[PDB]
C-alpha cells in the first residue's frame, strides 16, 4: 500500500507555504518544524539522521518527491490502535470506555473533511452498535 | 530528477530607479507630484477615531446611536487593543474600551450575550462580526465627521474621498489581512455592492488596492543557470529539409505544414515583415530550454522539436508554395527581401489545431484546456512572461496618442485614475482568432520577456503603461497652493511592480474566457436545441471556474477542491453562465425594445439592468464599424459583469493569502523567540501571542491550527500554575478537530 490523495494534499499545502521564497526548496535548517504540522512527534536525533541521510552534499535543500518518501519512512510505524484509542477518548467525558451514538455522528459531520450520512449511519450499523446502545470505541478500534 | 524552480521570490527596499520624470506638462506649464504617506495618513486617522471615541464617552449620550453600532465599536477596541504591542497605548485603549461594555452588559442582554460568545472564539474578534452586510455602515467615518469639529488635514479629506466605502478600511497590517482572507469562507455572506438611492456601488476593485498598497514592494532574481542570463553558444545546425511540395497539407500565416510517416507534422516558419534573425534564433534556443527542463518542472505539454534555422532563397519558396488556396494573403506576409530566414519543427497534429475549433467534443476540450492552463502558469512561476498570446485592443481611434496604447488592461481599475468598470471589448470574435492556444498545449513562445523585465523600466514597461510609472494627473487633484500634484496613486510608483504581476495573471485568464467563449458560440450558432444550449454553455462556465482553480493552486498552494469553493462563494456560476450564453450570440439581435430589457432583467437577478444607447445590427449586434460584434456599448463597460467579479476575487485571493501568511510568519517567529528564552516576559502575554498565532492561520485550513495547538500545549506546560480561563474552549474545539481527523482518516479502510 501507498498514502492515500488527501495525505498528499495535506503535505503539499503545507510544504507549498513553509517554502519562505516560494521557489520549490525548504531549508533544512527548519525541516523539524514543518514535521510538527503533519502529526509528527519528533526528537533532535532523527532530525539529524535525516539531514545526514539527505543533505550529505551540505546544498540543503529539499523537494516535493523527497519530502513525500521521507516522511513515508517516518510514517511506517508511529501510529497504533493506542493512538486512535486516545484519539477517542478525548470525548469519553467519564471515564467508563464507552461513547454516544449521536455525539459521533454530529463530530463526524460537523467537522474536518465533512462525510456523508450514508457512510457514517454505515459506520454504526456495521459496528454492530444499538441505537439506543453505548459506543464501545476500544471494543470498536479491535473490530476495526 | 529533483523538480525545483530557478526563480527566487525576495524583497527589496523600492523600485524607484531609473524612473519617467515625476513631473507633468500641461499647456507649457510644468507642474510636479508629491506622495501621500498611506500608512502615515491612516495611522493619524486611527489616532483621530480614538479621541472621537474619547469624545463621545464623555459626552454621556450613548443612546444616540442604534445598537449594532455600540457592539461594533467595543469589538473593534478590543481587537485594536489586542494588534498593538505598545504597553502604555494598550492600557489606554482598553480603559477607553470598558465603559462600553458598562453600558451594553446592562441595558441590551441578548447582544452582549452574542459578543461574549464571540470573545472566546477568537482574539481579532472584529473579523467574524463584519462577515455580513454589517460592513456597509461605515461606522468610524461617521463617527468621524459626528464628533471631529476641527478642520479635517487636507491628504486624510483625500483619503477618505477614495476609500468611503467601508469602515474595514482603517484596521492595521495584521487584521485587514485576516478579514479580507476570512470573507471566503462557507461563513461569509459578503457581497462587494451595496445600494443606496437606486445608485448602485461596486468596490470589488476597491478591496484589492487597499491590500496591495500594503505589501512590500516584490523583487525577483534568476538563478545563474537560468536561460536568460545563461550565454549559451550558437546554434549549430547543419541539418537541412530538401522540401517538396506533393507532400503539403496547407498554409497558415508564415507557416507551411508537410506530413511525416510517423504521423507527425514537420513545419517551416519564413520570418515576419520586419522580423529580423534576432527572434527566430530566440524561438530556437527557447524550445531547445524547455525540453532540456521538461522533467524538472513537469509540464504537461506535448511541447514542439526545433531541427534547423538558416537562409534559403525566396524563389524557391515561392515556387513551391504556389499550389494552395491562400497564395496572395502568403505572398504579402513574407518580407520583399531575395534572402530569407527559415525555422523548421516537429510537432504531433494537435498543435496546429487551435482551441477553439468546433470540431471537438466537450471532455476533450475540458483536459486540453486544463493542460494549456496548467502550463501557462507553471511557466509563469519559473520567469517567463507570455504578453502575446492574443491582441485584444481597446480601440483604435486613439491607438497611439492615447496612454495605454489601445492595450486592453484587464485591472484597469487598478492602473489609472478614475477608471472604474472594465472597458469594452472591440472586434473579439477575430481578436483571437489566431490564439496562442492549441490543444496538444503551449505554442509560439519566440515573444517571452523575463518577469525580471516586469520590474524594471524595459522597453515594454515604459511602452504601454506609461501612466503607471509617471504619477496621476487630474483636475481636482491640483493645488494652488502647493503647485505640486498631490496623490493616494502617486505612491504606486514605487509598487507597480506588485501592479503588473497581477495584471499578467488576470490579463491570462481573460484570454482563456474569450477562447472559451467564442468556442461556445461558434458551435452553438447551428443548434435548435434549447435544453441542449444551455448544455453547451454549462459546461464551459464550470470549465472556466476550474481554470480559475488550476490557477490559485499552483500560485499560492491551496488545494483546488478547497479553493473552487472559496471561489464559488463570490461569483455566482449561474450568473456567470447565463451572461455568457445572452452575450456572445447573434441570437438577441433579433429582439424588440421591451423583449431585451425583459432579458436583461432575467438575467442581472440583483443588479440593475445594463444600461446602453447604441443600435443593433442585425446578425451581428453591437457594432462600431458594422461587421465584427463586440463586447458592450459605446464608450461604457463590459457586459460581462460577473466576469470582472470573478478576476478580481482571482488576484485578492492570491495577493491575500500569500500576504497573509507572510503575516502568519511573522507571529510564529516572534512566539518561538517568546518560548526559547531571549524574550522574556509572564504567561498572559505568552498567552495573548499565542491566541494571535491561531487567528492568522489560512481560512478553512486544519494543519495550520495544528501546529499552534502544539505551541499552545508546550506553553502550558511551561507556566505551571498560570490561569487558563480564557484559552481553553478555542484549543478544546482544535483539539476536537484533530481527533476527528485522525478517526476519519482511519475508517479509509472500508475496501478489498
Ligand atoms: N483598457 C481600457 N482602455 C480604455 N478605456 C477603458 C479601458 N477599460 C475601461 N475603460 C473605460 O473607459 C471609459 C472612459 O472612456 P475613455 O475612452 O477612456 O475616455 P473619454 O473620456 O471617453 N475620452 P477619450 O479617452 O479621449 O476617448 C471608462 O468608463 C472606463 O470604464
Not at chain 1, 83 to 112: C, P, Q, W
Not at chain 2, 242 to 250: A, F, N, T, V
Not at chain 2, 642 to 655: D, F, G, H, Q, R
Request: hydrophobic share 35%.
Amino acid at each position: 500500500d501507498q498514502l492515500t490523495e488527501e495525505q498528499i494534499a495535506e503535505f503539499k499545502e503545507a510544504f507549498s507555504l513553509f517554502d519562505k521564497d516560494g521557489d520549490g526548496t525548504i531549508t533544512t535548517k527548519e525541516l523539524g518544524t514543518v514535521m510538527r504540522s503533519l502529526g509528527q512527534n519528533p526528537t533532535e536525533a532523527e532530525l539529524q539522521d535525516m539531514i545526514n541521510e539527505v543533505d550529505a552534499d551540505g546544498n540543503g535543500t529539499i523537494d516535493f518527491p523527497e519530502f513525500l518518501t521521507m516522511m513515508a519512512r517516518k510514517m511506517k510505524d508511529t501510529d497504533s490502535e493506542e493512538e486512535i484509542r486516545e484519539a477517542f477518548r478525548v470525548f469519553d467525558k467519564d471515564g467508563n470506555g464507552y461513547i454516544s451514538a449521536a455525539e459521533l455522528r454530529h463530530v463526524m459531520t460537523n467537522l474536518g473533511e465533512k462525510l456523508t450520512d450514508e457512510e457514517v449511519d454505515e459506520m454504526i450499523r456495521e459496528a454492530d452498535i444499538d441505537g439506543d446502545g453505548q459506543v464501545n470505541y476500544e471494543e470498536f478500534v479491535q473490530m476495526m | 530528477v529533483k523538480q525545483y524552480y530557478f526563480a527566487r521570490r525576495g524583497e527589496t527596499s523600492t523600485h524607484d530607479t531609473s524612473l519617467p520624470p515625476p513631473v507633468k506638462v500641461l499647456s507649457g506649464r510644468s507642474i510636479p507630484l508629491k506622495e501621500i504617506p498611506f500608512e502615515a495618513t491612516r495611522n493619524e486617522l486611527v489616532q483621530i477615531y480614538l479621541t472621537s471615541i474619547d469624545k463621545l464617552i464623555k459626552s454621556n449620550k450613548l443612546n444616540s446611536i442604534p445598537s449594532q453600532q455600540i457592539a461594533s465599536h467595543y469589538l473593534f477596541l478590543r481587537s485594536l487593543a489586542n494588534s498593538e504591542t505598545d504597553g502604555i497605548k494598550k492600557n489606554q485603549i482598553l480603559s477607553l474600551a470598558k465603559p462600553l461594555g458598562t453600558y451594553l452588559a446592562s441595558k441590551e442582554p441578548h447582544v452582549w450575550k452574542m459578543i461574549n460568545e464571540l470573545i472566546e472564539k477568537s482574539e481579532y474578534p472584529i473579523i467574524h462580526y463584519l462577515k455580513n452586510n454589517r460592513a456597509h455602515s461605515n461606522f468610524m467615518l461617521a463617527l468621524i465627521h459626528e464628533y471631529h469639529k476641527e478642520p479635517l488635514t487636507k491628504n486624510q479629506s483625500a483619503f477618505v474621498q477614495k476609500f468611503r466605502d467601508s469602515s474595514v478600511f482603517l484596521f492595521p497590517n495584521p487584521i485587514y489581512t485576516a478579514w479580507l482572507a476570512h470573507s471566503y469562507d462557507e461563513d461569509s455572506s459578503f457581497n462587494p455592492m451595496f445600494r443606496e438611492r437606486l445608485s448602485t456601488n461596486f468596490y470589488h476593485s476597491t478591496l484589492t488596492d487597499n491590500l496591495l498598497l500594503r505589501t512590500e514592494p516584490k523583487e525577483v532574481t534568476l538563478s545563474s543557470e537560468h536561460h536568460y542570463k545563461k550565454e549559451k553558444g550558437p546554434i549549430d545546425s547543419s541539418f537541412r529539409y530538401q522540401m517538396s511540395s506533393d507532400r503539403l497539407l496547407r498554409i497558415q500565416g508564415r507557416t507551411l505544414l508537410f506530413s511525416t510517416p510517423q504521423n507527425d507534422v514537420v513545419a517551416v516558419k519564413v520570418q515576419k515583415k520586419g522580423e529580423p534573425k534576432s527572434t527566430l534564433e530566440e524561438e530556437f534556443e527557447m524550445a531547445d530550454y524547455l525540453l532540456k527542463h521538461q522533467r524538472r518542472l513537469d509540464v504537461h505539454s506535448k511541447l514542439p522539436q526545433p531541427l534547423g534555422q538558416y537562409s534559403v532563397k525566396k524563389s524557391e519558396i515561392l515556387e513551391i508554395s504556389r499550389g494552395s488556396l491562400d497564395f496572395e494573403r502568403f505572398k504579402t506576409l513574407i518580407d520583399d527581401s531575395k534572402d530569407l530566414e527559415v525555422y523548421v519543427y516537429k510537432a504531433p497534429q494537435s498543435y496546429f489545431t487551435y482551441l477553439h475549433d468546433k470540431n471537438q467534443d466537450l471532455e476533450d476540450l475540458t483536459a486540453s484546456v486544463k493542460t494549456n492552463v496548467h502550463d501557462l502558469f507553471v511557466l509563469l512561476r519559473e520567469g517567463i512572461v507570455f504578453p502575446q498570446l492574443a491582441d485584444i485592443f481597446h480601440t483604435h481611434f486613439g491607438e497611439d496618442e492615447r496612454e495605454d496604447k489601445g492595450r486592453y488592461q484587464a485591472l484597469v481599475q487598478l492602473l489609472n485614475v478614475l477608471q472604474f468598470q472594465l472597458g469594452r471589448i472591440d472586434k473579439w470574435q477575430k481578436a483571437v482568432e489566431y490564439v496562442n492556444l492549441r490543444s496538444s498545449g503551449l505554442a509560439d513562445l519566440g515573444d517571452s520577456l523575463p518577469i525580471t523585465s516586469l520590474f524594471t523600466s524595459s522597453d515594454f514597461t515604459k511602452h504601454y503603461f506609461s501612466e503607471l510609472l509617471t504619477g496621476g494627473y487630474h483636475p481636482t487633484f491640483f493645488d494652488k497652493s502647493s503647485g505640486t500634484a498631490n496623490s493616494l496613486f502617486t505612491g504606486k510608483r514605487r509598487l507597480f511592480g506588485n501592479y503588473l504581476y497581477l495584471n499578467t495573471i488576470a490579463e491570462y485568464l481573460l484570454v482563456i474566457q474569450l477562447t472559451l467563449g467564442s468556442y461556445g458560440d461558434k458551435v452553438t450558432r447551428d443548434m435548435m436545441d434549447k435544453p441542449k444550449k444551455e448544455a453547451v454553455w454549462r459546461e464551459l462556465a464550470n470549465v472556466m471556474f476550474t481554470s480559475c482553480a488550476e490557477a490559485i493552486h499552483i500560485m499560492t498552494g491551496i488545494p483546488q477542491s478547497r479553493a473552487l469553493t472559496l471561489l464559488k462563494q463570490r461569483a455566482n456560476i449561474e450568473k456567470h453562465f447565463r451572461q455568457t450564453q445572452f452575450w456572445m450570440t447573434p441570437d438577441y439581435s433579433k429582439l424588440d425594445e421591451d423583449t431585451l430589457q425583459m432579458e436583461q432583467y432575467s438575467i442581472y437577478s440583483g443588479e440593475p439592468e445594463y444600461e446602453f444607447t447604441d443600435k443593433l445590427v442585425s446578425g451581428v449586434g453591437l457594432s462600431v464599424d458594422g461587421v465584427h460584434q463586440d463586447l458592450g456599448g459605446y464608450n461604457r463597460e463590459s457586459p460581462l459583469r460577473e466576469l470582472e467579479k470573478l478576476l478580481y476575487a482571482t488576484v485578492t485571493l492570491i495577493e491575500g493569502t500569500m500576504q497573509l501568511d507572510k503575516e502568519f510568519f511573522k507571529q510564529l517567529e516572534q512566539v518561538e523567540k517568546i518560548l526559547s528564552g531571549e524574550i522574556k516576559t509572564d504567561a498572559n502575554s505568552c498567552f495573548e501571542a499565542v491566541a494571535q498565532l491561531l487567528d492568522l492561520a489560512r481560512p478553512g485550513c486544519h494543519f495550520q491550527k495544528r501546529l499552534v495547538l502544539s505551541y499552545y500545549e508546550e506553553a502550558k506546560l511551561k507556566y505551571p500554575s498560570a490561569p487558563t480561563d480564557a484559552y481553553d474552549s478555542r484549543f478544546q474545539v482544535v483539539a476536537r478537530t484533530n481527533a476527528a481527523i485522525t478517526i476519519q482518516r482511519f475508517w479509509r479502510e472500508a475496501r478489498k
